[PDB]
Amino acid sequence: KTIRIGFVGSLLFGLLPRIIHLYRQAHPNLRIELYEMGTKAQTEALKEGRIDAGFGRLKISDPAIKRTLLRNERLMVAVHASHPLNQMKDKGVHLNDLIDEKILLYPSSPKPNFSTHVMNIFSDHGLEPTKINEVREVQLALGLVAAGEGISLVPASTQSIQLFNLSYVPLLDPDAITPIYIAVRNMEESTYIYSLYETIRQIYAYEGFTEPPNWL
Amino acid sequence: SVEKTIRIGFVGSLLFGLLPRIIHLYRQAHPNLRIELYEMGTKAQTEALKEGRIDAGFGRLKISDPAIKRTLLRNERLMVAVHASHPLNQMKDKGVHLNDLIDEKILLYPSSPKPNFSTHVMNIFSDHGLEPTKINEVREVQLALGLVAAGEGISLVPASTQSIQLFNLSYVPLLDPDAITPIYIAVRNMEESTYIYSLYETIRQIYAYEGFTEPPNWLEHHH
Ligand SMILES: [Cl-]
């Protein structure tokens, strides 16, 4: 009678909480254990049975795991209000506008992680940011930006964090995205997981995202 | 030069409030200076100050050590983070008292070594002979807030945490006058350098803009 759900910390700023809340309303008799962990930990947790569902942001594929893309979330650039890039907030900027800026990557957790994903997007277009500095967590990066130490690339849902003189600029490159996946065991056929799928679908319909006909 | 390098330690929770704009203004007013910033707990800041790893530390705990001195900057109010549908959310505009929270599922944080915010919050309850039963320890503030938003319970948070806004997360005023969390600036127990006095001056400026009530002696003594 216990569902165990793993999730990367960055998903706390997006739709995940309202998904869990709606899921809990339909399941008073179920025990919802929420675990914060990275995609690499979730994969091992799924096989072993430590979690039943995993929400992550990278696609490290595995025979025993069925991962489904929920959506591609936009990346944005966090800048100080006075930064030149903040003059291009309405229309947006491109990745190649960022290469001579002091870029704050995060987290400092084991790789692969969000900083590896960010650096991969740059390297996918032959872009080479020379002024790079890795810090521990998202709020540290935003704090440092607000204090005037650089810029940071962040998921759009990070706008949940509003700091004094911190502005978020849209990125125009189509592939300036960070995906969100739900991962379950390849064999999975539980009514709890399918109801979780249903809950996610229900909320994605409320927001009105573009989804295939066979999606979940 | 190393002489023109100032190293500042701070606890993570202070990034949601006034600290960043204080550092930005300090940097702006002293382009001569290299400012280095280190996130670390109040306990770590003590040894850092002693060995010269940092020159000033911003923290929320008074940990007495003869090698260190401090100044209280202000007492920040606490608030209760709740789900928008929670009964306590009816008091969002008026506020609630600590004894209203006793039978609630309270998410404490962080899960780092003690003493910390969880222990200080628990001390506030015990100071009034209140013993919350449903207590849960969680790693960090956004996990606590995310879980609150998921419907797991409530959490006591510094008021500047309101920088984080989540769907169906609401912040309720906590009315008890001692439901506060202090903010200190600690330095070596010696005469502050001119660079640290200049940091004091920046703090005074920002605090004047915010209208906080000090203390005639507060952060004074350049000469
Ligand atoms: Cl306050």
Coordinates of C-alpha atoms and ligand atoms in Angstrom, one line a residue:
Chain A
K1 CA 0.0 0.0 0.0
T2 CA 3.0 2.3 -0.6
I3 CA 3.9 4.1 -3.8
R4 CA 7.4 5.5 -3.9
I5 CA 8.2 8.4 -6.3
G6 CA 11.7 9.7 -7.1
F7 CA 12.2 13.2 -8.5
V8 CA 15.0 15.6 -9.3
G9 CA 14.9 18.8 -7.2
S10 CA 14.4 21.2 -10.1
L11 CA 10.9 19.7 -10.8
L12 CA 9.7 21.2 -7.5
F13 CA 9.3 24.6 -9.2
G14 CA 7.0 23.2 -11.9
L15 CA 3.9 21.0 -12.2
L16 CA 5.1 18.1 -10.1
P17 CA 3.7 19.3 -6.8
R18 CA 0.1 19.9 -8.2
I19 CA 0.4 16.5 -9.8
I20 CA 1.2 14.8 -6.5
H21 CA -1.5 16.8 -4.7
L22 CA -4.2 15.7 -7.2
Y23 CA -2.8 12.1 -7.1
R24 CA -3.1 12.1 -3.2
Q25 CA -6.8 13.3 -3.4
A26 CA -7.6 10.2 -5.4
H27 CA -5.6 7.9 -3.1
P28 CA -6.3 8.4 0.7
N29 CA -5.5 4.7 1.3
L30 CA -2.2 4.9 -0.5
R31 CA 1.1 6.0 1.2
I32 CA 3.0 8.4 -1.0
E33 CA 6.7 8.5 -0.3
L34 CA 8.5 11.3 -2.1
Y35 CA 12.2 10.9 -2.6
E36 CA 14.6 13.6 -4.0
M37 CA 17.2 12.0 -6.3
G38 CA 19.1 12.4 -9.6
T39 CA 18.3 10.4 -12.8
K40 CA 21.2 8.0 -12.2
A41 CA 20.0 7.2 -8.7
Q42 CA 16.4 6.7 -10.0
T43 CA 17.4 4.1 -12.6
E44 CA 19.1 1.9 -9.9
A45 CA 16.2 2.6 -7.5
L46 CA 13.6 1.4 -10.1
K47 CA 15.4 -1.9 -10.9
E48 CA 15.9 -2.6 -7.2
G49 CA 12.4 -1.5 -6.2
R50 CA 13.2 1.5 -4.1
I51 CA 11.0 3.7 -6.3
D52 CA 8.0 2.9 -8.6
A53 CA 8.1 6.1 -10.7
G54 CA 11.0 8.5 -11.4
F55 CA 10.8 12.0 -12.7
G56 CA 14.1 13.2 -14.3
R57 CA 15.7 15.3 -17.0
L58 CA 18.1 13.0 -18.9
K59 CA 17.5 10.0 -21.1
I60 CA 20.2 7.5 -19.9
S61 CA 18.4 4.6 -21.6
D62 CA 18.2 1.1 -20.0
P63 CA 16.6 -2.2 -21.0
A64 CA 14.6 -2.7 -17.8
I65 CA 13.3 0.9 -17.8
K66 CA 10.5 2.5 -19.8
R67 CA 11.0 6.3 -20.0
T68 CA 8.4 8.6 -21.5
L69 CA 9.0 12.2 -22.5
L70 CA 6.3 14.4 -20.8
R71 CA 7.5 17.7 -22.3
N72 CA 10.4 19.9 -23.3
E73 CA 10.8 22.8 -20.9
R74 CA 12.4 26.0 -22.3
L75 CA 15.7 27.2 -21.0
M76 CA 16.1 30.9 -19.9
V77 CA 19.0 33.1 -19.0
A78 CA 19.1 34.6 -15.5
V79 CA 20.8 38.0 -15.5
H80 CA 21.1 41.1 -13.4
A81 CA 18.5 43.8 -14.3
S82 CA 21.2 46.1 -15.6
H83 CA 22.9 43.4 -17.8
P84 CA 23.1 44.2 -21.6
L85 CA 21.3 40.9 -22.3
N86 CA 18.3 42.1 -20.3
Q87 CA 17.8 44.8 -23.1
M88 CA 16.8 41.8 -25.3
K89 CA 14.2 40.3 -22.9
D90 CA 11.0 40.8 -25.0
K91 CA 12.4 39.2 -28.2
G92 CA 15.0 36.9 -26.6
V93 CA 18.6 36.1 -27.2
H94 CA 20.6 33.2 -28.7
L95 CA 23.1 30.9 -27.1
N96 CA 26.0 32.5 -29.1
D97 CA 25.2 35.8 -27.3
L98 CA 26.3 34.2 -24.0
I99 CA 29.8 32.8 -24.8
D100 CA 31.9 35.7 -23.4
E101 CA 29.8 36.1 -20.3
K102 CA 30.6 34.6 -16.8
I103 CA 28.3 31.6 -16.8
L104 CA 27.3 30.0 -13.5
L105 CA 26.7 26.2 -14.0
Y106 CA 25.0 24.0 -11.4
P107 CA 24.8 21.6 -9.6
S108 CA 28.2 20.4 -8.3
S109 CA 26.6 16.9 -7.9
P110 CA 28.0 13.8 -9.7
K111 CA 27.8 13.9 -13.5
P112 CA 25.8 13.7 -15.7
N113 CA 23.7 16.5 -14.3
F114 CA 22.2 19.9 -15.4
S115 CA 25.6 21.5 -16.0
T116 CA 26.6 18.7 -18.3
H117 CA 23.3 19.1 -20.2
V118 CA 23.9 22.9 -20.5
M119 CA 27.5 22.5 -21.7
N120 CA 26.3 19.8 -24.2
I121 CA 23.9 22.3 -25.8
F122 CA 26.7 24.8 -26.3
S123 CA 29.1 22.1 -27.6
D124 CA 26.3 20.8 -30.0
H125 CA 26.8 24.1 -31.9
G126 CA 30.5 24.5 -31.6
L127 CA 30.1 27.1 -28.9
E128 CA 32.8 27.3 -26.2
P129 CA 32.1 29.5 -23.1
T130 CA 35.5 30.2 -21.7
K131 CA 34.3 31.9 -18.4
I132 CA 32.7 29.1 -16.5
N133 CA 32.2 28.4 -12.8
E134 CA 30.3 25.5 -11.2
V135 CA 28.3 26.1 -8.0
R136 CA 26.3 23.9 -5.7
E137 CA 22.7 24.6 -6.3
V138 CA 20.2 26.7 -8.4
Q139 CA 19.5 29.3 -5.6
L140 CA 23.3 29.8 -5.2
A141 CA 23.6 30.5 -8.9
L142 CA 20.6 33.0 -8.8
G143 CA 21.9 34.6 -5.7
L144 CA 25.3 35.1 -7.3
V145 CA 23.7 36.6 -10.5
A146 CA 21.7 39.0 -8.3
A147 CA 24.9 39.9 -6.5
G148 CA 26.4 40.7 -9.9
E149 CA 28.8 37.8 -10.5
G150 CA 27.5 36.6 -13.8
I151 CA 24.6 34.9 -15.7
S152 CA 23.1 31.4 -15.4
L153 CA 21.0 29.2 -17.7
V154 CA 17.9 27.8 -16.0
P155 CA 14.7 26.0 -16.7
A156 CA 11.7 28.4 -17.3
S157 CA 10.0 27.1 -14.2
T158 CA 12.8 28.6 -12.1
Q159 CA 10.9 31.9 -12.5
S160 CA 9.1 30.7 -9.4
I161 CA 12.2 32.2 -7.7
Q162 CA 12.0 36.0 -7.9
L163 CA 14.9 38.0 -6.5
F164 CA 15.5 41.7 -6.3
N165 CA 17.1 42.9 -9.6
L166 CA 17.1 39.4 -11.1
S167 CA 15.6 39.1 -14.6
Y168 CA 14.9 36.0 -16.8
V169 CA 15.6 36.3 -20.5
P170 CA 14.1 33.9 -23.1
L171 CA 16.5 31.8 -25.2
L172 CA 15.6 31.6 -28.9
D173 CA 17.5 28.5 -30.1
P174 CA 14.9 25.8 -30.7
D175 CA 17.0 23.2 -28.8
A176 CA 17.6 25.5 -25.8
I177 CA 15.3 23.1 -23.8
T178 CA 15.5 20.8 -20.9
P179 CA 13.3 17.6 -21.1
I180 CA 11.2 16.1 -18.4
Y181 CA 10.7 12.3 -18.4
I182 CA 8.6 9.9 -16.3
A183 CA 10.4 6.6 -15.8
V184 CA 9.0 3.3 -14.6
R185 CA 10.0 -0.4 -14.8
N186 CA 9.7 -2.0 -18.2
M187 CA 7.3 -4.6 -16.9
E188 CA 5.1 -2.1 -14.9
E189 CA 1.4 -2.7 -15.1
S190 CA 0.1 -1.3 -11.7
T191 CA -3.2 0.5 -11.3
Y192 CA -1.4 3.1 -9.1
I193 CA 1.2 4.0 -11.8
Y194 CA -1.5 4.1 -14.5
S195 CA -3.5 6.4 -12.2
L196 CA -0.3 8.5 -11.8
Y197 CA 0.0 8.6 -15.6
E198 CA -3.7 9.6 -15.7
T199 CA -3.1 12.4 -13.1
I200 CA -0.3 13.8 -15.2
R201 CA -2.4 13.6 -18.3
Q202 CA -5.3 15.3 -16.5
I203 CA -3.1 18.3 -15.5
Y204 CA -1.2 18.6 -18.8
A205 CA -4.7 18.9 -20.3
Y206 CA -5.5 21.6 -17.8
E207 CA -2.4 23.5 -18.9
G208 CA -3.1 22.4 -22.5
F209 CA 0.2 21.0 -23.7
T210 CA 0.7 19.4 -27.2
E211 CA 0.6 15.6 -26.7
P212 CA 0.5 12.6 -29.1
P213 CA -2.6 10.3 -29.4
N214 CA -0.8 7.4 -27.7
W215 CA 0.8 9.5 -25.0
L216 CA 0.6 7.7 -21.6
Chain B
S1 CA 46.2 41.9 -4.4
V2 CA 45.4 39.6 -1.5
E3 CA 45.2 42.8 0.6
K4 CA 42.4 44.0 -1.8
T5 CA 40.6 40.7 -1.6
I6 CA 37.6 40.4 0.8
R7 CA 36.1 37.0 1.4
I8 CA 32.5 36.7 2.7
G9 CA 30.7 33.7 4.1
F10 CA 27.0 33.4 4.2
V11 CA 24.3 30.8 5.0
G12 CA 22.2 29.8 1.9
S13 CA 18.8 31.1 3.2
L14 CA 20.2 34.7 3.0
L15 CA 20.2 34.6 -0.8
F16 CA 16.4 35.1 -0.8
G17 CA 16.6 38.4 1.1
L18 CA 18.8 41.5 1.3
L19 CA 22.2 39.9 1.0
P20 CA 22.7 39.9 -2.8
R21 CA 21.8 43.6 -3.2
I22 CA 24.1 44.4 -0.3
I23 CA 27.0 42.6 -2.1
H24 CA 26.1 44.2 -5.4
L25 CA 26.2 47.7 -4.0
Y26 CA 29.4 46.9 -2.0
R27 CA 31.0 45.7 -5.3
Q28 CA 29.7 48.8 -7.2
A29 CA 31.0 51.2 -4.5
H30 CA 34.5 49.4 -4.4
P31 CA 35.6 48.4 -7.9
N32 CA 39.1 48.3 -6.4
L33 CA 38.1 45.2 -4.4
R34 CA 37.8 41.6 -5.3
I35 CA 34.8 40.1 -3.5
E36 CA 34.8 36.3 -3.0
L37 CA 31.6 34.7 -1.8
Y38 CA 31.4 31.4 0.1
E39 CA 28.2 29.6 1.1
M40 CA 28.7 28.0 4.5
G41 CA 26.8 27.4 7.7
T42 CA 27.3 29.5 10.8
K43 CA 29.5 26.8 12.5
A44 CA 31.8 26.6 9.4
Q45 CA 32.1 30.4 9.4
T46 CA 33.6 30.4 12.9
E47 CA 36.7 28.4 11.9
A48 CA 36.9 30.2 8.6
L49 CA 37.0 33.5 10.4
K50 CA 39.7 32.3 12.8
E51 CA 42.0 31.0 10.1
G52 CA 41.3 33.8 7.7
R53 CA 39.4 31.8 5.1
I54 CA 36.7 34.5 5.3
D55 CA 36.7 38.1 6.7
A56 CA 33.0 38.4 7.5
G57 CA 30.3 35.9 7.9
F58 CA 26.5 36.4 7.6
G59 CA 24.6 33.8 9.7
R60 CA 21.4 33.1 11.6
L61 CA 22.9 31.6 14.8
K62 CA 24.7 33.1 17.8
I63 CA 27.5 30.6 18.4
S64 CA 29.7 32.1 21.1
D65 CA 33.5 31.9 20.5
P66 CA 36.0 34.2 22.1
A67 CA 37.9 34.6 18.9
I68 CA 34.8 36.0 17.1
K69 CA 32.5 39.0 17.7
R70 CA 29.2 39.8 16.0
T71 CA 26.5 42.4 15.5
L72 CA 22.8 41.6 15.2
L73 CA 21.6 43.0 11.9
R74 CA 17.9 42.3 12.4
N75 CA 15.3 39.8 13.6
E76 CA 13.5 38.5 10.5
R77 CA 9.9 37.4 10.9
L78 CA 8.9 33.8 10.4
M79 CA 6.0 32.7 8.4
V80 CA 4.0 29.4 7.9
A81 CA 4.1 27.9 4.4
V82 CA 0.8 26.0 3.8
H83 CA -1.2 24.6 1.0
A84 CA -3.8 27.1 -0.4
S85 CA -6.6 24.7 0.7
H86 CA -5.3 24.4 4.3
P87 CA -7.6 25.8 7.1
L88 CA -4.7 28.0 8.3
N89 CA -4.8 29.7 4.9
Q90 CA -8.0 31.5 6.0
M91 CA -5.8 33.6 8.3
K92 CA -3.4 34.6 5.5
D93 CA -4.1 38.3 6.0
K94 CA -4.4 38.4 9.8
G95 CA -2.0 35.6 10.8
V96 CA -1.7 32.8 13.2
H97 CA 0.1 31.9 16.4
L98 CA 2.5 29.0 17.2
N99 CA -0.1 27.2 19.3
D100 CA -2.3 26.9 16.2
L101 CA 0.4 24.7 14.6
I102 CA 0.8 22.1 17.3
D103 CA -1.2 19.3 15.6
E104 CA 0.0 20.0 12.1
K105 CA 2.5 18.0 10.1
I106 CA 5.5 20.3 10.3
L107 CA 8.3 20.0 7.8
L108 CA 11.6 21.1 9.5
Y109 CA 14.8 21.8 7.6
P110 CA 17.7 21.6 6.9
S111 CA 19.0 18.1 7.6
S112 CA 22.6 19.3 8.1
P113 CA 24.5 19.2 11.5
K114 CA 23.1 20.9 14.6
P115 CA 22.5 23.6 15.8
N116 CA 20.4 24.7 12.8
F117 CA 17.1 26.3 11.7
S118 CA 15.2 23.1 12.7
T119 CA 16.6 23.3 16.3
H120 CA 16.0 27.0 16.6
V121 CA 12.4 26.7 15.4
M122 CA 11.9 23.8 17.9
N123 CA 13.4 26.0 20.7
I124 CA 10.8 28.7 20.0
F125 CA 8.0 26.1 20.6
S126 CA 9.5 24.7 23.8
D127 CA 10.1 28.2 25.1
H128 CA 6.3 28.4 25.4
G129 CA 5.7 24.9 26.6
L130 CA 4.6 23.7 23.2
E131 CA 5.5 20.2 21.9
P132 CA 4.6 19.6 18.2
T133 CA 4.0 15.9 17.7
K134 CA 4.1 15.5 13.9
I135 CA 7.7 16.7 13.0
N136 CA 9.6 15.7 9.8
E137 CA 13.2 16.6 8.9
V138 CA 13.8 17.5 5.3
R139 CA 17.0 18.4 3.3
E140 CA 16.4 22.0 2.2
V141 CA 13.8 24.8 2.0
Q142 CA 12.6 24.1 -1.6
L143 CA 12.0 20.5 -0.8
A144 CA 10.0 21.6 2.3
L145 CA 8.1 24.1 0.1
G146 CA 7.6 21.6 -2.7
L147 CA 6.2 19.1 -0.3
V148 CA 3.9 21.7 1.3
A149 CA 2.7 22.4 -2.3
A150 CA 2.2 18.7 -2.9
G151 CA 0.0 18.6 0.3
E152 CA 2.3 16.9 2.8
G153 CA 2.0 19.5 5.6
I154 CA 3.3 22.9 6.6
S155 CA 6.7 24.5 7.3
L156 CA 8.0 27.5 9.3
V157 CA 10.2 29.7 7.1
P158 CA 11.9 33.1 7.1
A159 CA 9.7 35.8 5.6
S160 CA 12.2 36.4 2.7
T161 CA 11.4 32.8 1.6
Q162 CA 8.4 34.6 -0.1
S163 CA 10.9 35.1 -3.0
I164 CA 9.8 31.5 -3.9
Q165 CA 6.2 31.4 -5.2
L166 CA 4.7 28.0 -6.1
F167 CA 1.2 27.1 -7.4
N168 CA -1.1 26.5 -4.4
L169 CA 1.6 27.6 -1.9
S170 CA 0.6 30.3 0.5
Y171 CA 2.6 32.1 3.3
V172 CA 0.8 32.9 6.6
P173 CA 2.1 35.5 9.1
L174 CA 3.2 34.0 12.4
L175 CA 2.1 36.5 15.1
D176 CA 4.2 35.6 18.2
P177 CA 6.7 38.5 18.7
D178 CA 9.5 36.0 19.2
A179 CA 8.6 33.9 16.1
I180 CA 11.7 35.4 14.5
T181 CA 15.0 34.3 13.1
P182 CA 18.0 36.5 13.6
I183 CA 20.6 37.7 11.1
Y184 CA 24.1 38.4 12.3
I185 CA 27.3 39.6 10.8
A186 CA 30.4 38.0 12.5
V187 CA 34.0 39.0 12.2
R188 CA 37.3 38.2 14.0
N189 CA 37.4 39.6 17.6
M190 CA 39.7 42.5 16.6
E191 CA 39.4 45.9 15.0
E192 CA 37.6 45.5 11.7
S193 CA 39.5 46.5 8.6
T194 CA 38.5 49.5 6.5
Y195 CA 37.1 47.1 3.9
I196 CA 34.8 45.5 6.5
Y197 CA 33.8 48.9 7.9
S198 CA 32.9 49.8 4.3
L199 CA 30.7 46.6 4.2
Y200 CA 29.0 47.8 7.4
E201 CA 28.3 51.1 5.7
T202 CA 26.6 49.3 2.8
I203 CA 24.5 47.3 5.2
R204 CA 23.5 50.5 6.9
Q205 CA 22.5 52.1 3.6
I206 CA 20.3 49.2 2.4
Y207 CA 18.7 48.9 5.9
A208 CA 17.9 52.6 5.8
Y209 CA 16.1 52.1 2.5
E210 CA 14.1 49.3 4.0
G211 CA 13.1 51.3 7.1
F212 CA 14.4 48.9 9.8
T213 CA 14.7 50.2 13.3
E214 CA 18.2 50.2 14.8
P215 CA 20.3 51.2 17.7
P216 CA 22.4 54.5 17.8
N217 CA 25.6 52.5 18.1
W218 CA 24.6 50.1 15.3
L219 CA 27.6 49.2 13.0
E220 CA 29.3 52.5 13.8
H221 CA 33.0 53.3 14.4
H222 CA 35.2 54.1 11.3
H223 CA 37.7 56.8 12.3
Ligands
CL1 CL 11.0 40.3 8.1

